[PDB]
Amino acid sequence: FDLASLAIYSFWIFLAGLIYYLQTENMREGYPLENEDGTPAANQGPFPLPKPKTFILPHGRGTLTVPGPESEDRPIALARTAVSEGFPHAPTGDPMKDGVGPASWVARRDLPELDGHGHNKIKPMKAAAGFHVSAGKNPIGLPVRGCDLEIAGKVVDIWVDIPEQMARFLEVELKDGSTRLLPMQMVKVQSNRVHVNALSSDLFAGIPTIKSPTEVTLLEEDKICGYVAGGLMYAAPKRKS
Amino acid sequence: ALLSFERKYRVPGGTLVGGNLFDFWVGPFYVGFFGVATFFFAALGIILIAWSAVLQGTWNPQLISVYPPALEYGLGGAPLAKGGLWQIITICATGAFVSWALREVEICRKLGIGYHIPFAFAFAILAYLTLVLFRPVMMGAWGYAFPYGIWTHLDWVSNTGYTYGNFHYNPAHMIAISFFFTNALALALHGALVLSAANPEKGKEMRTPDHEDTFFRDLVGYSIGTLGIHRLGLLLSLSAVFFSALCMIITGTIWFDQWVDWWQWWVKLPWWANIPGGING
Amino acid sequence: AEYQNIFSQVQVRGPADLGMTEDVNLANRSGVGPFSTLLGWFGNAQLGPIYLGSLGVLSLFSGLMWFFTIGIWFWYQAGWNPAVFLRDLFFFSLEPPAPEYGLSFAAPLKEGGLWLIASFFMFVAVWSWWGRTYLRAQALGMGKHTAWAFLSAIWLWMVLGFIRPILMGSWSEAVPYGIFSHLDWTNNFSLVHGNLFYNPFHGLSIAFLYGSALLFAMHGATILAVSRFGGERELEQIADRGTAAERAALFWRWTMGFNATMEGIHRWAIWMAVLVTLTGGIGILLSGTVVDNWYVWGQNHG
Numbered sequence: 028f029d030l031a032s033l034a035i036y037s038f039w040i041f042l043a044g045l046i047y048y049l050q051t052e053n054m055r056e057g058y059p060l061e062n063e064d065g066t067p068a069a070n071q072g073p074f075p076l077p078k079p080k081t082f083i084l085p086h087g088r089g090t091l092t093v094p095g096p097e098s099e100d101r102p103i104a105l106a107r108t109a110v111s112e113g114f115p116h117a118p119t120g121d122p123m124k125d126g127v128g129p130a131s132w133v134a135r136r137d138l139p140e141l142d143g144h145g146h147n148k149i150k151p152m153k154a155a156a157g158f159h160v161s162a163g164k165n166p167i168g169l170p171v172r173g174c175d176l177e178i179a180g181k182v183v184d185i186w187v188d189i190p191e192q193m194a195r196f197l198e199v200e201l202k203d204g205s206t207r208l209l210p211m212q213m214v215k216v217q218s219n220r221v222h223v224n225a226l227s228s229d230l231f232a233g234i235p236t237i238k239s240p241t242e243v244t245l246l247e248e249d250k251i252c253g254y255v256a257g258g259l260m261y262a263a264p265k266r267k268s
Numbered sequence: 269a270l271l272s273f274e275r276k277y278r279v280p281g282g283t284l285v286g287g288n289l290f291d292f293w294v295g296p297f298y299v300g301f302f303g304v305a306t307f308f309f310a311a312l313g314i315i316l317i318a319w320s321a322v323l324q325g326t327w328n329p330q331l332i333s334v335y336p337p338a339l340e341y342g343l344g345g346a347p348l349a350k351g352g353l354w355q356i357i358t359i360c361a362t363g364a365f366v367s368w369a370l371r372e373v374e375i376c377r378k379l380g381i382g383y384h385i386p387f388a389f390a391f392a393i394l395a396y397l398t399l400v401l402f403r404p405v406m407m408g409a410w411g412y413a414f415p416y417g418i419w420t421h422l423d424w425v426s427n428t429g430y431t432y433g434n435f436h437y438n439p440a441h442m443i444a445i446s447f448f449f450t451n452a453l454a455l456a457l458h459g460a461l462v463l464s465a466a467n468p469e470k471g472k473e474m475r476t477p478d479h480e481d482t483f484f485r486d487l488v489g490y491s492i493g494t495l496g497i498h499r500l501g502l503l504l505s506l507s508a509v510f511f512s513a514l515c516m517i518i519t520g521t522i523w524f525d526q527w528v529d530w531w532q533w534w535v536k537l538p539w540w541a542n543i544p545g546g547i548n549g
Numbered sequence: 550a551e552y553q554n555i556f557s558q559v560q561v562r563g564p565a566d567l568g569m570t571e572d573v574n575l576a577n578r579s580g581v582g583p584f585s586t587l588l589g590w591f592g593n594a595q596l597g598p599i600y601l602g603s604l605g606v607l608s609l610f611s612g613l614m615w616f617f618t619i620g621i622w623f624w625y626q627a628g629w630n631p632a633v634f635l636r637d638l639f640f641f642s643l644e645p646p647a648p649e650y651g652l653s654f655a656a657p658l659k660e661g662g663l664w665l666i667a668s669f670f671m672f673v674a675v676w677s678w679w680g681r682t683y684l685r686a687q688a689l690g691m692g693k694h695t696a697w698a699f700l701s702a703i704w705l706w707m708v709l710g711f712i713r714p715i716l717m718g719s720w721s722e723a724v725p726y727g728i729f730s731h732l733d734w735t736n737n738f739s740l741v742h743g744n745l746f747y748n749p750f751h752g753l754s755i756a757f758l759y760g761s762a763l764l765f766a767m768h769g770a771t772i773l774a775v776s777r778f779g780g781e782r783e784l785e786q787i788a789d790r791g792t793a794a795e796r797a798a799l800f801w802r803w804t805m806g807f808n809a810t811m812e813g814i815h816r817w818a819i820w821m822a823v824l825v826t827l828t829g830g831i832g833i834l835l836s837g838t839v840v841d842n843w844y845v846w847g848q849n850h851g
């Protein structure tokens with residue numbers, strides 16, 4: 028009829044095409060859908076998989092094409108608890124060591140994240156020229172306490188993001204002279220101590236170690252962060268008040 | 269069916285009520301005790317809206333409207349046909365929203381993540397409760413609440429505003445709008461920035477966060493950084509809703525005259541109140 | 550309680566970052582500014598450097614001329630008295646020419662002439678700022694997404710101040726420069742066009758403005774919740790999916806039945822926001838050119 032009705036009807040058609048485009052772009056990871064045993068599910072939904080795109084990664088690190096063949100590339104220590112679809116899967120060993128549930132990690136590349144100039148993004152502050160604590164309480168030297176109110180160690184360095192100028196891990200020394208990394212997002216700095224709610228003192232030695240003392244890889248960060256977040260569920264027995 | 273990477277996360281535990289009784293999924297959806305509660309409250313709410321429609325005499329969704337009790341009932345119960353249904357549906361709606369938040373908390377526990385999402389959602393719930401519970405109680409009648417209907421609720425917005433003149437002149441409403449407009453600006457910039465680094469000029473390598481900071485310093489002399497922009501969006505969005513609730517809790521209670529007239533406090537300060545000229549002298 | 554990651558517990562600082570080079574002309578970057586400890590609790594502490602070439606100088610110069618054009622008019626309405634100036638600040642107004650003059654530039658300074666001068670200066674300030682968002686992206690080899698999204702905001706401003714007045718045949722249909730006066734104009738526009746709640750484009754615009762707040766609350770809260778697995782590092786999570794991105798997707802899949810990717814949530818984001826000013830500009834353009842009364846229109850067209 029009139030030009031305003033032509034406009035509103037055109038707009039609704041545009042919006043339907045836009046939602047279609049947006050949903051298919053959000054299917055570039057994780058699909059096709061699967062059954063509980065890893066085979067392809069029968070009903071994938073009404074939206075098809077998008078045609079593949081390729082990212083060119085910087086610093087000679089190659090390309091990525093998605094969607095592409097999906098696999099976990101690691102063992103999963105879990106078993107069914109019911110004879111039909113839709114129930115939980117129980118750990119078959121120790122879920123902190125096996126890396127399942129809230130303790131899960133992914134098999135990212137075993138190289139460190141690089142910066143704009145091709146140098147390691149995260150370094151210990153001792154090896155990062157001109158870096159220093161500019162505000163707040165400096166943690167280096169403080170004892171570290173677990174959720175059982177017992178001392179697990181002391182802080183010996185901060186690991187910093189150089190490009191973004193941010194504290195990312197604390198490096199902690201244990202009773203036997205070895206060290207581990209703790210994510211800054213899972214600690215609480217106080218006047219006289221660092222406190223860690225997610226872990227009890229006896230679980231600190233099981234934190235995954237890094238293979239070189241002056242860098243961390245993407246695979247290593249995932250294993251470390253997955254393991255400390257997992258203690259919220261699996262350490263709870265020793266947590267207290 | 270599951271996403272290719274999902275099975276390792278579907279473990280037992282994290283529930284707040286019921287132990288393992290309701291610890292299961294239907295397709296993609298997690299259930300839990302609070303999944304059962306939201307279904308019960310939602311279904312009962314929908315049935316009562318239907319019953320309201322028979323008594324009105326339409327099934328047209330553009331005309332169905334459920335009205336609160338008229339002012340003469342004050343804060344008591346009303347008959348179903350004349351406001352009682354609105355009172356019961358409001359109880360169901362509140363029960364559904366709170367249940368939906370607590371179900372989100374169980375999901376957080378199973379996945380080992382922070383509680384920031386249900387915390388943010390609780391601000392929306394608050395804004396709803398200000399309009400249908402807190403303001404009406406402080407004013408002395410359920411009748412000051414809004415009706416449930418597609419067009420009739422806009423009518424309420426229009427009549428409520430024009431009761432105090434041009435509502436633009438509410439100062440808390442001015443601040444709330446600034447936050448809404450600023451939040452939409454920031455959301456456009458964040459999405460554009462990340463996409464412009466993941467999708468560079470044809471044939472070039474993906475950019476780095478260093479390119480993202482550089483872009484913004486070249487442009488406005490400052491970059492807030494990748495952690496900072498997510499903190500910022502959370503804050504602008506919640507502040508917008510906080511000042512919206514505040515701008516209505518004061519209207520009809522501490523202030524009930526025309527909002528334009530409030531600004532006379534500024535112009536009547538004795539220093540300049542009598543100097544001639546300008547607009548107000 | 551758990552740490553929440555809204556403010557940082559410790560700040561760390563190194564040498565000033567001069568930034569990436571790529572094809573940028575370095576002769577046009579300033580020096581670095583000072584560091585702010587205050588800002589550093591919430592984001593980055595470094596101020597500067599800034600780029601400033603021919604197009605930035607132009608934008609700034611005309612931007613200030615627009616400001617001072619408005620400012621001297623306000624002073625003159627205040628009779629040059631600084632007490633009156635602060636007292637009546639929100640009430641002063643620079644108004645467009647009267648209907649009498651139509652689209653001509655022949656009106657006197659005191660009665661529309663200054664409004665035209667101020668609008669000239671605003672027009673060059675904004676369009677040159679737009680050019681600079683395009684060029685700064687190109688010098689670094691990045692996509693043009695920021696310039697395309699800014700264009701959607703420019704559309705609504707262009708319709709309000711230039712395109713709709715041209716099509717109606719007079720400058721008197723445009724918006725005055727004033728704090729309270731531009732609110733009165735907004736209220737009056739709705740009254741005269743039969744209540745803007747019946748404009749379907751106005752309703753859509755509101756859906757996207759509410760939805761932008763919904764979506765940034767969802768997205769911001771989600772990334773803070775997975776920051777304990779390095780979730781804010783969004784670009785590398787695109788290139789090599791980690792447990793941060795998997796847990797973020799499953800929260801939403803388990804809650805509402807579907808989910809995004811780390812790249813894909815940013816496409817939802819840019820579109821939700823851009824559609825606010827896109828639908829809004831259309832709704833205003835049609836008002837008074839094609840439809841005089843939205844109530845009346847709604848009665849005849851479902």
Ligand code: BCL
Pocket residue numbers: 365392393394395396398399424425426428429430434435436441444445448509511512513515516735
């Ligand atoms: C003529 C009318 C007056 C006026 C009168 C009013 C009145 C009256 C009010 C506002 C309010 C607001 N106005 Mg005003 N306003 C006017 C002009 C404007 C203009 C403008 C450009 O001119 C703007 C930008 C605004 C902006 C705003 C916002 C600040 C605020 C609304 C957001 C809000 O509260 O969200 C809060 C969000 C919610 C309440 C949503 C809650 C969602 C709940 C929790 C869950 C829903 C679940 C749902 C049922 C799920 C279904 C699921 C499906 C099955 C899938 N007004 C004019 C001058 N304005 C309102 C306000 O501040 O309210 C507190 C208000 O009451």
Ligand code: BCL
Pocket residue numbers: 314317396399414418419421422425751752753755756757759760763
């Ligand atoms: C916030 C201040 C005012 C108000 C002012 C306005 C104004 C002004 C406008 C709207 C508009 C809308 N309002 Mg209202 N609105 C209010 C309170 C609410 C509440 C509530 C329970 O608190 C609800 C559910 C709604 C719902 C709606 C939608 C019908 C419509 C688009 C909103 C949107 O996209 O948001 C953002 C959310 C999303 C994009 C997510 C999707 C949400 C979907 C679309 C909600 C559908 C609800 C469904 C129809 C009702 C439930 C049905 C069953 C019983 C479950 N409003 C308060 C009283 N609202 C616009 C309109 O077009 O009205 C006709 C409009 O112009």
Ligand code: BCL
Pocket residue numbers: 425449452675702703705706735736738739744745746750751754755758825826828829830832833
């Ligand atoms: C009584 C008044 C009427 C009414 C009259 C109008 C009118 C008239 C309009 C709106 C418009 C809008 N209204 Mg309405 N509106 C009413 C009731 C409401 C209610 C409500 C709850 O009741 C709500 C939520 C809204 C919401 C909205 C928005 C969705 C929309 C504005 C989008 C935007 O981001 O603009 C803000 C963005 C811009 C203005 C773009 C700016 C771009 C430029 C380039 C920036 C230059 C910056 C400069 C150089 C720097 C200077 C610095 C400064 C000094 C700070 N209205 C009532 C019914 N509303 C607008 C619209 O789209 O309508 C369809 C519009 O024109």
Ligand SMILES: CC[C@H]1c2cc3[nH]c4c(c3C)C(=O)[C@H](C(=O)OC)c4c3nc(cc4[nH]c(cc(n2)[C@@H]1C)c(C(C)=O)c4C)[C@@H](C)[C@@H]3CCC(=O)OC/C=C(\C)CCC[C@H](C)CCC[C@H](C)CCCC(C)C
Pocket residue numbers: 306309310313314357360361364365368385386388389391392415416417418421505506509759760762763766767804805
């Ligand atoms: C605080 C900032 C903003 C915000 C945030 C926010 N909203 C959220 C969340 C967050 C963080 C969620 O996690 C949650 C979610 O799951 O999103 C997908 C949600 C959510 N925000 C929603 C909507 C919504 N949010 C809005 C606003 C906002 N949400 C703010 C602007 C608005 C409006 C009007 O602006 C709406 C419409 C839902 C999509 C979802 C919550 C879903 C939910 O509670 O489901 C349980 C209930 C039901 C399934 C149905 C109940 C049926 C009732 C019993 C009967 C209906 C009665 C109703 C009152 C009638 C209304 C009639 C109208 C015409 C007036």
Ligand SMILES: CC[C@H]1c2cc3[nH]c4c(c3C)C(=O)[C@H](C(=O)OC)c4c3nc(cc4[nH]c(cc(n2)[C@@H]1C)c(C(C)=O)c4C)[C@@H](C)[C@@H]3CCC(=O)OC/C=C(\C)CCC[C@H](C)CCC[C@H](C)CCCC(C)C
Pocket residue numbers: 449450452453456457488608609612613616674675678679682695696698699700701702822823825826
């Ligand atoms: C998608 C729709 C939303 C949107 C998007 C959007 N806006 C944008 C962009 C985008 C994508 C940009 O890229 C662009 C930008 O650069 O953002 C950083 C912009 C922008 N949006 C802006 C504002 C803005 N956007 C708004 C709205 C919106 N923008 C929508 C909600 C609004 C309103 C009314 O709601 C406003 C007010 C600007 C910040 C910026 C565009 C800048 C511009 O055009 O500037 C012209 C230049 C001037 C006016 C120069 C004068 C300014 C100062 C007076 C200079 C100060 C220096 C002086 C020398 C002082 C010296 C002091 C010393 C002694 C210390």
Ligand SMILES: CCCCCCCCCCCC[N+](C)(C)[O-]
Pocket residue numbers: 046050071072296806807808
């Ligand atoms: C306005 C946004 C709401 C519309 C979005 C619709 C998306 C439904 C997508 C179904 C997802 C497919 N699935 C579950 C099989 O993976």
Ligand SMILES: CCCCCCCCCCCC[N+](C)(C)[O-]
Pocket residue numbers: 488489490579580581582583596597598599
């Ligand atoms: C939007 C925030 C505004 C920040 C503006 C800061 C600009 C910094 C300019 C660099 C300082 C130049 N200096 C002082 C070294 O000569």
Ligand SMILES: CCCCCCCCCCCC[N+](C)(C)[O-]
Pocket residue numbers: 619668709710711723724725726727728731
């Ligand atoms: C022709 C209209 C163009 C849109 C301008 C809208 C008015 C801007 C309101 C701010 C007025 C200027 N000032 C000095 C108070 O900032």
Ligand SMILES: CCCCCCCCCCCC[N+](C)(C)[O-]
Pocket residue numbers: 748749750752753756760820821
């Ligand atoms: C990109 C996200 C899409 C979200 C879709 C939101 C739909 C809102 C429906 C509101 C109806 C508006 N109406 C009837 C006035 O035209």
Ligand SMILES: CCCCCCCCCCCC[N+](C)(C)[O-]
Pocket residue numbers: 295296805806807
């Ligand atoms: C207008 C808002 C309506 C939004 C409905 C979106 C819900 C999508 C859930 C679909 C996933 C469930 N299932 C069984 C198809 O997989």
Ligand SMILES: [Fe+3]
Pocket residue numbers: 458462768772783
């Ligand atoms: Fe993001």
